[PDB]
Design a protein around this nucleic acid. Structure first.
Lengths: 245, 431
RNA sequence: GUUUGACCUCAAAUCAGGUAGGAGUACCCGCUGAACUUAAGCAUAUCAAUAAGCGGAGGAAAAGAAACCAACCGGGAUUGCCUUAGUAACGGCGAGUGAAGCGGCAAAAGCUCAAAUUUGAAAUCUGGUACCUUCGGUGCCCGAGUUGUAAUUUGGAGAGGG
RNA sequence: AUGGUGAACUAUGCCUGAAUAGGGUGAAGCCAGAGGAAACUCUGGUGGAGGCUCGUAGCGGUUCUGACGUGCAAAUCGAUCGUCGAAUUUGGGUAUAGGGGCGAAAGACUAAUCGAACCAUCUAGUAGCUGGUUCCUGCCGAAGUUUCCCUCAGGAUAGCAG
RNA sequence: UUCAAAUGAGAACUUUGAAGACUGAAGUGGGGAAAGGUUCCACGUCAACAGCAGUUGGACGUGGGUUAGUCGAUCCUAAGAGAUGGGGAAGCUCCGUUUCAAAGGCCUGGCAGGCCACCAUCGAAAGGGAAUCCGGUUAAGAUUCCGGAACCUGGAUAUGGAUUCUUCACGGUAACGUAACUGAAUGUGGAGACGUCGGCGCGAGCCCUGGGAGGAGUUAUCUUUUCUUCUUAAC
RNA sequence: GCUUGUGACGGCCCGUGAAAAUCCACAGGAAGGAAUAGUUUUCAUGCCAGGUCGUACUGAUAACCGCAGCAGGUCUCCAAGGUGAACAGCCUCUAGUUGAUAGAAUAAUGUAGAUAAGGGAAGUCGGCAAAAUAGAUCCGUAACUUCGGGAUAAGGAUUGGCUCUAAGGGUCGGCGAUCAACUUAGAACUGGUACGGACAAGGGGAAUCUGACUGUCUAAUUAAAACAUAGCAUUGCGAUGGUCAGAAAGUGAUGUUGACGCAAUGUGAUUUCUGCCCAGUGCUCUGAAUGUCAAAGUGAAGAAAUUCAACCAAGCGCGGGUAAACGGCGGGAGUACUCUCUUAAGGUAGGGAUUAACGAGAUUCCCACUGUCCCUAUCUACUAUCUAGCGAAACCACAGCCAAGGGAACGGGCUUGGCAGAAUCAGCGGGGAAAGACCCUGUUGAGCUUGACUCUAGUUUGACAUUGUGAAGAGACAUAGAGGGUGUAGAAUAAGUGGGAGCUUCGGCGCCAGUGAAAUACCACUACCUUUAUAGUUUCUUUACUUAUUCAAUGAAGCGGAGCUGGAAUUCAUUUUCCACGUUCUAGCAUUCAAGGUCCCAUUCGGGGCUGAUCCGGGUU
RNA sequence: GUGGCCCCUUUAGUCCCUCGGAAUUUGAGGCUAGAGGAAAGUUACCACAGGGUGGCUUGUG
RNA sequence: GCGUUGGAUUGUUCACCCACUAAUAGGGAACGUGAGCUGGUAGACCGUCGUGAGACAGGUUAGUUUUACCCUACUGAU
């Protein structure tokens, strides 16, 4: 048989991301003495757009303490920040939107974004548009902190891990229909080559497990296993269930 | 996914089984719903009547409770608090209503109790008191005659679940405290003379076959069943002692008195005429196979057979094959002579057919293989007449009798039949 | 003495002087490694411990002076030829595969380290430099080296003491 | 099978650049007037939206008992037709290499080669069946179930002749 | 397509002239990129080729011809390619492009004290980019040569000018202005540097057109007539 | 007015539309500089130099690629006048070309066009093809409709030329003077067979099936109801990760990513509909014990090789979930059969179905129109034809008149007959030329599929090694022990079997007495069941440490502990915890070993130290 | 009158042979005598090599 | 000997229908394998079957052979 599309996706010839017009990798400030003990102030200069991304970014300028110079970080903007705003980042920072704090300092019930799975990760969770995590409780002994993620899962992580207050901007982006193939074309033009998607049923047997037949059908049971391997995993990888909910 | 997670239980339980210190509020959010649901369930095509249902569509409340019961039964071990009364709620949901619950919910609770007993949350001593009372209630004849009562299916489910329970309990070592307790309920069911010992016999046979209840205490139960008045209980006992018999005969307390009581109660005593022929024959088989094996003496058997020993009678080849099985070396051969002379008068007489004569001779020679001095030389010769009979049934039959008496009493045979070694043995031993 | 030095380890130089690469590759030393074919079709098998591919040398290479063959009245490094032998043996015991000792011959060749206290004298060696009779010698000066350079000894023997 | 060469055509992605008359319809926003208590409505204008439309260049390639058929041409010529401001057309640079790539998916395209490219070697590969097999004369001279290996079957044999 | 003449042994096909037509500014024109490589131009010149012909030719034989501080490459980086250090791999070689390196360049005053922080290289003759225009000239070369007139970079530098005894300028309320009017480390900002369509405005060139000064053509009748020249570069 | 450049604006985006080199300015103020004279080369002038390579020509119906001087293909700039909406079509100016084998005739058949009386689809599988319509102004425009369209719907009145009228503007003057363009409406007259006079340029309508649409593909026979599409639904994944690569790697794509995301599938706009089954096959479950149960490891026998037994992970088996998973289509009860009754895929209403637009998609009918046809005729151009020059190809056993016969149903050759006169030109397509599919077979070649066979990458679970330092518990081997038995009756809870009528502390008692299949004292046998202890033997679970190992980050910057210091803080006498001297109205600034204080030297135009800024540490975090 | 009318499994060897440097004991191999008895489909997307009238009838069951 | 038609019907025609007509007769030379011109493999969909690749009880749709210039015959011409 042939090698199939998902197997070809791993080499990364024509499936690499399209990264020319991206403003830069969005990240939090590196964990330093200031963020660990007190706070530090920066100025948000520009609220800007990032190609291939629905959420906007913010350019935040901070003052290097060890040398006389300026350092520009690229944050993911939360809903409500504005140019000329002061962003306070650290342990002793106040509880306002856009500020960066550790999860142990804040109380439970608060809303944060761009959370680090571990301290020094510089942003892992709640980065897409309209997304947020909710702190539900702390455990100061054994220092840990329990959070709820956008998928609904509940996790426990270090209280020294950081996050930025508020909701990521750009919400509602998926409530608008596209109505046209051209808008999907231009959307994925800047993300990657995962569009259009031909159906495996419409191919020959060399090209897919689902291919073949005088009628467009699958010969079996679209729930594949998890111990399957590299050419068998067509659809519904490890389905605990199927059907409408 | 977050808003749908409360609706998706299969993902919730896999998440809870990982980190159950989290997902406390997610569990309370469902336990409250389960409580509010059980608090509810606690309490035709004609032109006139309301339309009926197909039997497979259900309510959205029941479809939710059936899911919540499984979720709570699978995470009770993670949340021992807030679930301590859950199995008692299930138990008093079952054995106080029995009827305001749909069959799917009943089945779900019955399986959740079984897995809650597989895990050591619940004990067998309190699961038995849930399972047994439902059998008698769904074998009621008044509960099983609704519109869509699933009484037969429930009676099968509870039965196989009891079997799984006892198989579970008797794996490592035999839980005598449990077996001795649930044999007492079989005894106390067989007392109730209507039909309720069915669920004792049908269960003890299964456990004997699975080898879980090899004990002297159990064979007494089936003895009492065989000595019962109900036909479908007596038959269960008889077919147990049959299954050629099984090792249970070697755990009886008095086989002779057992056979005597059987022959007196069922067949001869009152002549109630309850059993049909197909059951009378199975009783005869048991009696004769006990008798021949254990050297018993009743002497009424051998006149009871004579009514039925006629070729114009229904399925006589089974009766006469049990006639021989009640013969010995140690019984008065006159009461068997009358039997042999009935058979000879009615099966190898004038004009009879080939199959009839062959059946007669074949069932006489296998009598004489146990009771050799039960027919005399004068009729022995009359029957070895039929050696060269041209029919190939009677010849094969007569040769068997000749070879039987060639090794046992060859002087009854004539010189023509003593085959080269019986005659030589007689010639040396006659001088 | 929070100073001044010795050693050890690791580096740097367009430092002084040399060295490797690549080609050819008939033969040679290894590594890696197929299928066509033949077996009935074919997984064992055969083609084959082959072809292709990789690394590495020389005028020859490799091997080589027994941890050998033997069971004899004992032979006596290695290599090659005649023969042993299409044999012993291996194998769907099929297709097929398949050596070795002995004997005759060609050519002939033996040896070296470590392990031993010079301990009454590191006796050893590279380089730099000045002369010379320059494929090298003598002197002198930095250095290597005792965590062992020379002489002496290699199992056939051999050493020390007399 | 082994080892190698190809994205100058063509498939797809990326980078950097370029090209695309004249008309028809007339969306949001806006101006005035009339009717209103006011929600708002009606009329006349403005404006110039659209993976709209007619239709050039351009891109494609529907139909013709079309021309040609050793043709201008190893796919062309004519007329007719689809589309024509965008999922558009295109140059150069770049990436993906063979049981691999790419594919808006026809098993399509991958240098006139694709249900597995091209080059060389293993290789005088091989079944099966076909075709052919080179001077004269003389003498002798046939054969077609007779018996069988898992039925065809390629065979092994009886008999015939030298 | 035609007529005459010339050339020549020979002219339907060459040259000139006289006619008639065609492409009809989305050209049968004038220039370029890729590719080609002297095919360009001249002098001789017909054996073969130009599916007839041939005195002709992109043919044959021999020569000539391509001039740059300003046009380009060169430089920069784009997608991307690719060494080193290190790590794999029997190995031909693979990974990856700042990595887990002691990766080098500045100051002050038997070398002593300080400061800086960072990755080879390649990759566009349509992207970015310092600076030249006119006229004339050749058989064939030109934004390259000739004449004339300018500009950019880099370097050494003298004079004048400006400033200064209130040492590193004044004016203007201000927006800001001027011939200038010191400035190391370090830091910051800007330019380079950017989509597409719609209509509106402004400019250049072209189109159309009038009077006048010249030349040509028609004139059988008419037409103060039809056509044409009257231009102004970089800086 | 055309082309082009430019400016300020507006609209569009789940699209917001390169980087670097290079240049400048600003902040800052190290520093150096005038007085009897300096400073400034960002003002003006003046001086010197600028290397290497390319540079001709074509850029195409003859300079490139197609075997070629091939009607094919191949990127781009400039672009005049008229008609006309127009870079359309037609004619012309500048510039260029006049190249493509010629001459004579005008037969048929052809190729490319054109016209035709009356009838108008009688033709034909089929109105194929052709014809007809066509531009602009005005009137008018149905069903249906996703209310946006359908729609140029349809169907009708007109169009020339000439002479006029009216209206539509700008600049200056305290309504006039002056200047200028083409836009429309209207009237009169006039020629006509024709007036969008050539060119140019929709045929329309009533319905059906189908896919929503725009778009894409089989280069070189299939452009479509196929693919894609937006929309719809499902699944996996919270980074120690999901999906996918790589021989390996201190290796990679998604990923400059983070659930409004990535990956994997199916369906295929909107509207309407969307009922039930987890028996089966798949998928899944942090699913007990028992069963099956590999290697290592353990025990027994033996002189040993070996043999046996026990233990034995995952997986299987077992039982729970799931159908916008493949399947599939009823349920229950009473005695597979047989009787019974519920069937909730019920139309919610008798307004339940009258249902767009788009399409080189498949189909029928009507109007109009015609040489499709009756029924053919005529004309034009290039060929054919003849001539000068040039000059192939296919095919070819030998050849070439017919009939009958034999014959493989079938002769040009043989037999018997009919006949038979040179050499030839133009035509024709009957035969010969003379060069197909379909069917079958190989014990074939390849492609594809599957619980066909043998294998395998990958993945998964177990053992060993890497692998070191501590502790606490549970189970088992193995011995030593200790006790036990309710179906009923019987005084009583009878393993069972065999001997029988006392050893006697008591003569309690055992025998003789019921009842029971079996009879109990007393003493032996050998079955099961349950518990007590650990010489030892082992196995297993949990937990601690860090230096191996592993992961990530950085500028390897602030780590760990301190009567630290100073504050409070609440204590039950002395602590324990918080803080720390550092920063939160504001789109500013923060840099020269850091000023100051303090000790010493030198008096210099300034140097050095402590402190400002707590101490220690063999761990960068 | 010496009867009747038609090839891969396993066991055992007195004092059987061998295990090739000698022996003993286990095992193994022989020769005897006994007892038993590897593998499924599809191809129209395809490719290759080969092969392929007896004068017959008529209108009447 | 001479004539033996024109048309309708493809949810089909191994045929039938109504008209005109003097009449609207039957057949062969092909169909005793296969031979002018015209209707009646590759792509795609629905149905039946198949675990599946695919096949079919089907049905619908779209879908490139191209002489004669040679001999003979025939027709006309020397």
């Amino acid at each position: 048989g042939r090698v199939i599309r998902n197997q070809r996706k791993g080499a990364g010839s024509i499936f690499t991301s399209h990264t020319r017009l991206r403003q830069g990798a969005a990240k939090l400030r590196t964990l330093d003495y200031a963020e660990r003990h007190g706070y530090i102030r920066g100025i948000v200069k520009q609220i800007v757009h990032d190609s291939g991304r629905g959420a906007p970014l913010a350019k935040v300028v901070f003052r290097d303490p060890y040398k006389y110079r300026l350092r520009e970080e690229i944050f993911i903007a939360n809903e409500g920040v504005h140019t000329g705003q002061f962003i306070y980042a650290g342990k002793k920072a106040s509880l306002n939107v856009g500020n960066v704090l550790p999860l142990g300092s804040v109380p439970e019930g608060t809303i944060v974004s761009n959370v680090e799975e571990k301290p020094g990760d510089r942003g892992a969770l709640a980065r897409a548009s309209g997304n947020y995590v909710i702190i539900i409780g702390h455990n100061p002994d054994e220092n840990k902190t329990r959070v709820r993620l956008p998928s609904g899962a509940k996790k426990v992580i270090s209280s020294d891990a950081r996050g930025v207050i508020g909701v990521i901007a750009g919400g509602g982006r998926v409530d608008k229909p596209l109505l046209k193939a051209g808008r999907a074309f231009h959307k994925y033009r800047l993300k990657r080559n995962s569009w259009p998607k031909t159906r495996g049923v419409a191919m020959n047997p060399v090209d897919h497990p689902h291919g073949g037949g005088n009628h467009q059908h699958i010969g079996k049971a679209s729930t594949i296993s998890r111990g399957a391997v590299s050419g068998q995993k067509a659809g519904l990888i490890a389905a605990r269930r199927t059907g409408l909910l | 996914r977050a808003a749908m997670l409360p609706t998706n239980i299969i993902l919730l339980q896999n998440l809870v089984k990982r980190d159950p210190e989290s997902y406390q509020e997610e569990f309370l959010q469902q336990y409250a719903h389960y409580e509010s649901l059980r608090d509810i369930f606690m309490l035709g095509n004609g032109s006139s009547t309301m339309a009926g249902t197909n039997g497979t569509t259900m309510s959205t409340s029941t479809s939710q409770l059936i899911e919540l019961v499984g979720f709570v039964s699978q995470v009770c071990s993670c949340f021992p608090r807030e679930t301590a009364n859950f199995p008692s709620e299930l138990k008093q949901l079952l054995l106080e209503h029995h009827k305001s619950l749909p069959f799917e919910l009943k089945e779900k609770i019955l399986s959740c109790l079984t897995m809650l007993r597989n895990k050591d949350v619940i004990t067998a001593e309190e699961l038995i008191q849930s399972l047994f009372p439902l059998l008698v209630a769904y074998s009621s004849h008044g509960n099983s005659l609704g519109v869509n009562s699933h009484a037969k299916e429930l009676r099968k489910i509870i039965y196989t679940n009891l079997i799984s329970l006892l198989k579970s309990c008797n794996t490592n070592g035999k839980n005598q405290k449990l077996n001795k307790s649930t044999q007492a309920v079989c005894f106390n069911l067989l007392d109730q003379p209507d039909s309720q010992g069915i669920w004792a016999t049908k269960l003890t046979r299964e456990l004997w076959r699975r080898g879980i209840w090899d004990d002297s205490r159990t064979v007494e139960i089936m003895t009492q069943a065989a000595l019962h008045q109900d036909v479908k209980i007596v038959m269960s006992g008889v077919m147990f002692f049959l299954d050629l018999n099984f090792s249970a005969i070697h755990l009886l307390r008095d086989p002779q008195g057992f056979a005597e009581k059987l022959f007196k109660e069922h067949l001869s005593g009152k002549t109630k005429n309850k059993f049909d022929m197909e059951q009378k024959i199975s009783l005869m088989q048991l009696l004769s196979r006990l008798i021949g094996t254990h050297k018993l003496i009743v002497l009424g058997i051998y006149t009871f057979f004579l009514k039925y020993l006629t070729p114009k009678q229904r399925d006589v080849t089974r009766i006469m094959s049990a006639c021989a099985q009640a013969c010995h070396d140690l019984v008065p051969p006159e009461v068997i002579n009358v039997m042999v002379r009935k058979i000879a008068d009615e099966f190898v007489s004038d004009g009879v057919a080939n199959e009839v004569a062959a059946a007669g001779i074949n069932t006489i020679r296998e009598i004489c293989s146990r009771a050799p001095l039960a027919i005399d030389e004068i009729l022995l010769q009359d029957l070895v007449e039929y050696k060269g009979s041209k029919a190939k049934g009677v010849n094969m039959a007569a040769k068997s009798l000749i070879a039987l008496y060639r090794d046992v009493a060859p002087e009854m045979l004539k010189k023509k039949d003593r085959g080269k070694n019986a005659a030589m043995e007689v010639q040396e031993a006659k001088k």
